[PDB]
Amino acid sequence: TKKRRNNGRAKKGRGHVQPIRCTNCARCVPKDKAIKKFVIRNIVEAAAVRDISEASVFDAYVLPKLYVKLHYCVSCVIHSKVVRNRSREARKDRTPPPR
Amino acid sequence: FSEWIDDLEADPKGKFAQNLLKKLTG
Amino acid sequence: MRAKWRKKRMRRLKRKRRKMRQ
Amino acid sequence: VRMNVLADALKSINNAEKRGKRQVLIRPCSKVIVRFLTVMMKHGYIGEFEIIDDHRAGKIVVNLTGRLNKCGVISPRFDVQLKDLEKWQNNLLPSRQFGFIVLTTSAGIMDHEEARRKHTGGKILGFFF
Amino acid sequence: GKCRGLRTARKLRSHRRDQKWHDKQYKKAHLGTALKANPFGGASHAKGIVLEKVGVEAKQPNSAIRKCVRVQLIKNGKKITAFVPNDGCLNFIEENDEVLVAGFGRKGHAVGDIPGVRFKVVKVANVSLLALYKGKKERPR
Amino acid sequence: GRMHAPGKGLSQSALPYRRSVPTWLKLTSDDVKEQIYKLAKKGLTPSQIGVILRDSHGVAQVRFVTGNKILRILKSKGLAPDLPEDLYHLIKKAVAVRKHLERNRKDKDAKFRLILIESRIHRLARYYKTKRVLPPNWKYESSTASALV
RNA sequence: CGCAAGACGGACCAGAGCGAAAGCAUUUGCCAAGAAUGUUUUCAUUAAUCAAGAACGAAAGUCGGAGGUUCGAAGACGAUCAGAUACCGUCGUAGUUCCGACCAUAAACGAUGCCGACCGGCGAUGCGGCGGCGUUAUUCCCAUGACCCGCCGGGCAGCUGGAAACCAAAGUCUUUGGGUUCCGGGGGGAGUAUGGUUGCAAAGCUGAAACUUAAAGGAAUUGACGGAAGGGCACCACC
RNA sequence: ACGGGGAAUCAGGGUUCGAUUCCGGAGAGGGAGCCUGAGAAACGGCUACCACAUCCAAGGAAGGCAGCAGGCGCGCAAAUUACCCACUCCCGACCCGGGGAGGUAGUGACGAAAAAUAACAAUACAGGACUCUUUCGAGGCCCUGUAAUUGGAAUGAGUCCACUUUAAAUCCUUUAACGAGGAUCCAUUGGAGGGCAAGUCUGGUGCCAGCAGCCGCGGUAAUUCCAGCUCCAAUAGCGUAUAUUAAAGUUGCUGCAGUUAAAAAGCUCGUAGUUGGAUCUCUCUCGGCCGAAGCGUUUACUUUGAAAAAA
């Protein structure tokens, strides 16, 4: 039967969507179907901040950030536990997790 | 009536299933 | 059998049959 | 496109009565539509209605009483002879006590009882009960 | 949807007659291939000469041996397997004696656990199998 | 909806209930007709004539003041085009897309749109041949389409 | 640090737009087209659907001509496993790119023909138009662009009768008739055989029967299982 | 596939069948050509070929049952080489002759109608039946029958009589002589798990034999097989096999379905096809209510009127 009303993708009112490659396996997944994360992390982990800050030439340097756009196929996104299977009623929820 | 009920509920799907259900009220 | 491979085997049989026929 | 405006008028009336509304807007108006509504109103099913006159094709605001179970059109307008009318009312009417079949006949548009009284067959427009 | 027009009678009739050919019984009754493939040639019974006796194994859920006879129909010279119905009735039948054979009751469909047998022996040696079974008559000398 | 497009638009003019000549219009029926003849002599199709009269001189509908439609007036005196305005514009659009197709033979959307325009032209020409606005042997053909515009 | 090739157009990019569908994303110019809105313009039934016919139609594939950057059917090797010549890794030929000619098939899908009415509500969003307090930007006399609040029209959506899953259409159906096209008739045999037709080929379109079978299948319940996820537990589990 | 009249369900609509006695057509083993005649391309007429076939003295001659009966053959499948012109009619020169047209018997389950196989005890019983006074107690006031002890009355199936019947006649009908108490003057066919009415009673068999349209019974306590008993269904009738109709709203015009069960063409143009918006209320003659005469723009229509064989 029809598991999802949008077929698990965001394709409405168009025929073809250019595919992208999963960041793990390089699987061809449509850009709307793929699961996209936008990681904005510190280039230095919170454990290594103190050493590089102490050894910094410039006081108040504010360390830069790593910006990465991660695309996942459904299989890799399930395996990496980014998304989980949800109940029939909780599937419909579109609100991102509160974090 | 009770004997038919006993025979039916002993083996509700065995060989003596359709006949007992029919004999119940028909 | 998977239907795609069933069709593929049928097509291969047809190709062999038409090769045998002149 | 919009063919057989009588079908649209009757469908609009039926849908408005299903929703319990007190008034329904029918557009476009037509001579056949007005005659059908008059036949309906003589039997107390539809109550008074008012023809809004715009200069192209009128509309009709039809008051509604909850007295109409169903109003329907018959397409195509089959030519029904007086000997074959009993079969048509057996097919279309809920019982012989009530319900009407509207025929357009050489004597005008009227129910099947008037068509039998006037000994006129014609073409079936629709039915209501 | 279906066309509802005062002048659609040709379209309606042509569509109905074309769609009737997608019906199993209509096609088997009117196409003609079923009648040719019928061993009886469209008859209800047929007389044949018993080619041999044979035992067929019943379909898996129930186990037995059905005592059928391979006969050859006189009219068209076809080979048929006909089920001798009752018990000990195969003893009433010998080799190369004419038997009247009818259908099995399912119009060419095999009946019961018997695989691929759609005929039953009705009469053997011009005397009914029922009469032999009930002892009313004997096999002619 | 549209006969060759999936859209279904409600946009179109809405004539008021009153059919009378408006109060603001002092321009008499014969003066309106004279302006119509001057505009048509300048070489304007009935649609453009009506647009100009409604915009600048000010007329609700020419049919309300003069009693006849603009194309009918032009025919009555006689300055109307040999072939109807809408058919002529459809033929011109077909000619334009055909001329574009010569140096853009890889344009397969222009080919589809030309087919649509030619289907519209054929439908309109059939209608006009029905009503004697066109001769019964009037054909639309690419080799002579530019001869009519 | 440069230089040369091809390929591709990230982030912006969205249940957003356009297109008949296939499909379409770097700037600019040219060419032709298009919907929607506005319209007190024009014609005045010119219309809806469609046998036949026709245009287009992903990828792959075929035939010629350019170029081989990457990836890569086939193939050659390299790897625990009982066995890859499978999944993994390294190479790698056709192909992947463009220009002509074919091919006309996809889970070509919304598995939902098109046109026309009627049928609840809501909040958004795209385009056009209308109305309006206020804040922003081009000299201090305005429109206008960006916001803000509504309205109307069209559009992809979202939310809140059916066997049921579900659907504001899959509703207005035993209270059964708006118009029209294609199309199905238990499961296999079988989209097979054969005939016709198209094609360079692959193959496409149209398409049975003998025979066989009492089920196949749809939706949902309960359990059991899952080399599925989450949370707990046991020295008949481990550490 | 000879056509039609017509035959099989009735919800309405329909779906099939019509070789078959009535009306047409066609043919006489297959073709063809003819004579005579008002009428034939006739075949119970001819001619000659093709295929079969009959006598022969081997020179020749004669053929046509898809007429009536009968044979052979084919097949699942179909009657006795009966009597008669008495009826119906036909033919003829005819009141008179002839008619396998036709009639009347023969042949059994084509089928349809009607309709036997029984109607009435003292008796003990399982009962009950209007206020039963008692579980130990009036029960032909009302009814069913376990019956090795019963009784009268009725009658036709049958065999015979009278020859009514009919063209001798068997036939129903009629009258009469015999003709019933295991009224032996003996009712069968198919079933008993469900569908679907009626036993988990007994004995045998032990996944065997077999039953079972379907689902399913049978692998030593079978409600299903084989038998006994008992019972129910129809009944002089029941079973079976194919065809067919309703069931089948599983062909859907009435009246189906096409998201996921089978299914919407990949998409859009397109001619035929189907469908299509509002809108129209001294013309005419004999006597100061009449036949004629109608282009009202032809229609589809409705509703009358003749004409639509008979069965």
mmCIF file of N, CA and C in Angstrom, chain F residues 32-79:
data_model
loop_
_atom_site.group_PDB
_atom_site.id
_atom_site.type_symbol
_atom_site.label_atom_id
_atom_site.label_comp_id
_atom_site.label_asym_id
_atom_site.label_seq_id
_atom_site.Cartn_x
_atom_site.Cartn_y
_atom_site.Cartn_z
ATOM 1 N N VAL F 32 -19.185 59.386 -33.607
ATOM 2 C CA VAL F 32 -18.485 58.152 -33.265
ATOM 3 C C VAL F 32 -18.180 57.359 -34.527
ATOM 4 N N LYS F 33 -19.149 57.275 -35.440
ATOM 5 C CA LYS F 33 -18.924 56.569 -36.696
ATOM 6 C C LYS F 33 -17.821 57.231 -37.512
ATOM 7 N N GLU F 34 -17.807 58.564 -37.556
ATOM 8 C CA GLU F 34 -16.772 59.281 -38.294
ATOM 9 C C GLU F 34 -15.391 59.009 -37.709
ATOM 10 N N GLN F 35 -15.285 59.023 -36.379
ATOM 11 C CA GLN F 35 -14.025 58.665 -35.738
ATOM 12 C C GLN F 35 -13.631 57.232 -36.072
ATOM 13 N N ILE F 36 -14.614 56.331 -36.128
ATOM 14 C CA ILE F 36 -14.343 54.943 -36.482
ATOM 15 C C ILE F 36 -13.769 54.855 -37.887
ATOM 16 N N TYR F 37 -14.368 55.583 -38.833
ATOM 17 C CA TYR F 37 -13.871 55.531 -40.207
ATOM 18 C C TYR F 37 -12.467 56.107 -40.300
ATOM 19 N N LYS F 38 -12.203 57.203 -39.587
ATOM 20 C CA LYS F 38 -10.859 57.773 -39.595
ATOM 21 C C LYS F 38 -9.840 56.795 -39.021
ATOM 22 N N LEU F 39 -10.188 56.132 -37.916
ATOM 23 C CA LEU F 39 -9.278 55.165 -37.312
ATOM 24 C C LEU F 39 -9.022 53.991 -38.244
ATOM 25 N N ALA F 40 -10.069 53.494 -38.903
ATOM 26 C CA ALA F 40 -9.895 52.381 -39.827
ATOM 27 C C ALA F 40 -9.106 52.792 -41.061
ATOM 28 N N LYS F 41 -9.234 54.051 -41.487
ATOM 29 C CA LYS F 41 -8.420 54.552 -42.587
ATOM 30 C C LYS F 41 -6.958 54.643 -42.181
ATOM 31 N N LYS F 42 -6.697 54.957 -40.911
ATOM 32 C CA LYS F 42 -5.325 54.915 -40.422
ATOM 33 C C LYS F 42 -4.759 53.501 -40.427
ATOM 34 N N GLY F 43 -5.606 52.487 -40.576
ATOM 35 C CA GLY F 43 -5.142 51.118 -40.701
ATOM 36 C C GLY F 43 -5.203 50.325 -39.414
ATOM 37 N N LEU F 44 -6.287 50.476 -38.660
ATOM 38 C CA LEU F 44 -6.438 49.828 -37.367
ATOM 39 C C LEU F 44 -7.566 48.806 -37.409
ATOM 40 N N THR F 45 -7.304 47.635 -36.836
ATOM 41 C CA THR F 45 -8.292 46.574 -36.773
ATOM 42 C C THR F 45 -9.398 46.936 -35.782
ATOM 43 N N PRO F 46 -10.564 46.284 -35.880
ATOM 44 C CA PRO F 46 -11.680 46.657 -34.993
ATOM 45 C C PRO F 46 -11.340 46.607 -33.514
ATOM 46 N N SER F 47 -10.509 45.656 -33.088
ATOM 47 C CA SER F 47 -10.106 45.606 -31.687
ATOM 48 C C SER F 47 -9.341 46.863 -31.294
ATOM 49 N N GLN F 48 -8.397 47.282 -32.138
ATOM 50 C CA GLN F 48 -7.632 48.487 -31.851
ATOM 51 C C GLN F 48 -8.513 49.726 -31.913
ATOM 52 N N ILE F 49 -9.470 49.753 -32.844
ATOM 53 C CA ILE F 49 -10.398 50.878 -32.924
ATOM 54 C C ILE F 49 -11.189 51.000 -31.631
ATOM 55 N N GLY F 50 -11.724 49.877 -31.150
ATOM 56 C CA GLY F 50 -12.480 49.904 -29.912
ATOM 57 C C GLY F 50 -11.633 50.307 -28.724
ATOM 58 N N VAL F 51 -10.395 49.811 -28.664
ATOM 59 C CA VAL F 51 -9.501 50.179 -27.569
ATOM 60 C C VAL F 51 -9.251 51.681 -27.573
ATOM 61 N N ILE F 52 -8.951 52.238 -28.748
ATOM 62 C CA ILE F 52 -8.657 53.665 -28.841
ATOM 63 C C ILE F 52 -9.881 54.487 -28.465
ATOM 64 N N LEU F 53 -11.060 54.086 -28.944
ATOM 65 C CA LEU F 53 -12.269 54.845 -28.640
ATOM 66 C C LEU F 53 -12.612 54.781 -27.158
ATOM 67 N N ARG F 54 -12.442 53.615 -26.535
ATOM 68 C CA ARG F 54 -12.724 53.486 -25.113
ATOM 69 C C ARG F 54 -11.718 54.252 -24.267
ATOM 70 N N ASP F 55 -10.470 54.341 -24.723
ATOM 71 C CA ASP F 55 -9.418 54.922 -23.898
ATOM 72 C C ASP F 55 -9.370 56.440 -24.021
ATOM 73 N N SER F 56 -9.418 56.962 -25.247
ATOM 74 C CA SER F 56 -9.165 58.379 -25.490
ATOM 75 C C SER F 56 -10.448 59.189 -25.649
ATOM 76 N N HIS F 57 -11.293 58.830 -26.616
ATOM 77 C CA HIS F 57 -12.518 59.595 -26.823
ATOM 78 C C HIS F 57 -13.541 59.296 -25.735
ATOM 79 N N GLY F 58 -13.671 58.030 -25.363
ATOM 80 C CA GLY F 58 -14.514 57.612 -24.265
ATOM 81 C C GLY F 58 -15.839 57.076 -24.750
ATOM 82 N N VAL F 59 -15.937 55.759 -24.897
ATOM 83 C CA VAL F 59 -17.180 55.085 -25.253
ATOM 84 C C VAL F 59 -17.238 53.781 -24.471
ATOM 85 N N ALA F 60 -18.364 53.538 -23.808
ATOM 86 C CA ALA F 60 -18.561 52.271 -23.122
ATOM 87 C C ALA F 60 -18.506 51.136 -24.133
ATOM 88 N N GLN F 61 -19.461 51.129 -25.059
ATOM 89 C CA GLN F 61 -19.487 50.191 -26.170
ATOM 90 C C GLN F 61 -20.013 50.923 -27.389
ATOM 91 N N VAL F 62 -19.317 50.775 -28.517
ATOM 92 C CA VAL F 62 -19.764 51.418 -29.747
ATOM 93 C C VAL F 62 -21.138 50.904 -30.148
ATOM 94 N N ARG F 63 -21.437 49.644 -29.835
ATOM 95 C CA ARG F 63 -22.734 49.082 -30.191
ATOM 96 C C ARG F 63 -23.867 49.773 -29.445
ATOM 97 N N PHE F 64 -23.586 50.328 -28.267
ATOM 98 C CA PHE F 64 -24.628 50.999 -27.501
ATOM 99 C C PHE F 64 -24.976 52.366 -28.073
ATOM 100 N N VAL F 65 -24.002 53.073 -28.635
ATOM 101 C CA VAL F 65 -24.247 54.416 -29.148
ATOM 102 C C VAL F 65 -24.640 54.390 -30.620
ATOM 103 N N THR F 66 -23.933 53.627 -31.455
ATOM 104 C CA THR F 66 -24.225 53.609 -32.882
ATOM 105 C C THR F 66 -25.241 52.550 -33.280
ATOM 106 N N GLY F 67 -25.490 51.561 -32.425
ATOM 107 C CA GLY F 67 -26.405 50.487 -32.736
ATOM 108 C C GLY F 67 -25.799 49.337 -33.509
ATOM 109 N N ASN F 68 -24.551 49.456 -33.947
ATOM 110 C CA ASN F 68 -23.877 48.406 -34.690
ATOM 111 C C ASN F 68 -22.467 48.229 -34.155
ATOM 112 N N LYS F 69 -21.956 47.010 -34.274
ATOM 113 C CA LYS F 69 -20.591 46.731 -33.864
ATOM 114 C C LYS F 69 -19.607 47.332 -34.864
ATOM 115 N N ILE F 70 -18.369 47.528 -34.405
ATOM 116 C CA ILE F 70 -17.394 48.294 -35.176
ATOM 117 C C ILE F 70 -17.119 47.622 -36.515
ATOM 118 N N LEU F 71 -16.904 46.307 -36.496
ATOM 119 C CA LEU F 71 -16.652 45.584 -37.736
ATOM 120 C C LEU F 71 -17.861 45.654 -38.657
ATOM 121 N N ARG F 72 -19.064 45.603 -38.086
ATOM 122 C CA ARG F 72 -20.269 45.729 -38.895
ATOM 123 C C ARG F 72 -20.365 47.105 -39.542
ATOM 124 N N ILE F 73 -20.021 48.162 -38.802
ATOM 125 C CA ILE F 73 -20.025 49.510 -39.369
ATOM 126 C C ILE F 73 -19.032 49.602 -40.520
ATOM 127 N N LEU F 74 -17.827 49.070 -40.303
ATOM 128 C CA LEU F 74 -16.797 49.120 -41.330
ATOM 129 C C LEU F 74 -17.228 48.362 -42.576
ATOM 130 N N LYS F 75 -17.876 47.210 -42.399
ATOM 131 C CA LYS F 75 -18.402 46.481 -43.549
ATOM 132 C C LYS F 75 -19.510 47.263 -44.242
ATOM 133 N N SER F 76 -20.391 47.899 -43.466
ATOM 134 C CA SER F 76 -21.510 48.629 -44.050
ATOM 135 C C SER F 76 -21.021 49.730 -44.978
ATOM 136 N N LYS F 77 -20.125 50.588 -44.491
ATOM 137 C CA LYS F 77 -19.531 51.564 -45.402
ATOM 138 C C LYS F 77 -18.600 50.884 -46.394
ATOM 139 N N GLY F 78 -17.786 49.964 -45.903
ATOM 140 C CA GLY F 78 -16.864 49.155 -46.666
ATOM 141 C C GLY F 78 -15.462 49.704 -46.540
ATOM 142 N N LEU F 79 -14.782 49.288 -45.467
ATOM 143 C CA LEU F 79 -13.336 49.431 -45.348
ATOM 144 C C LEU F 79 -12.753 48.256 -44.570
#
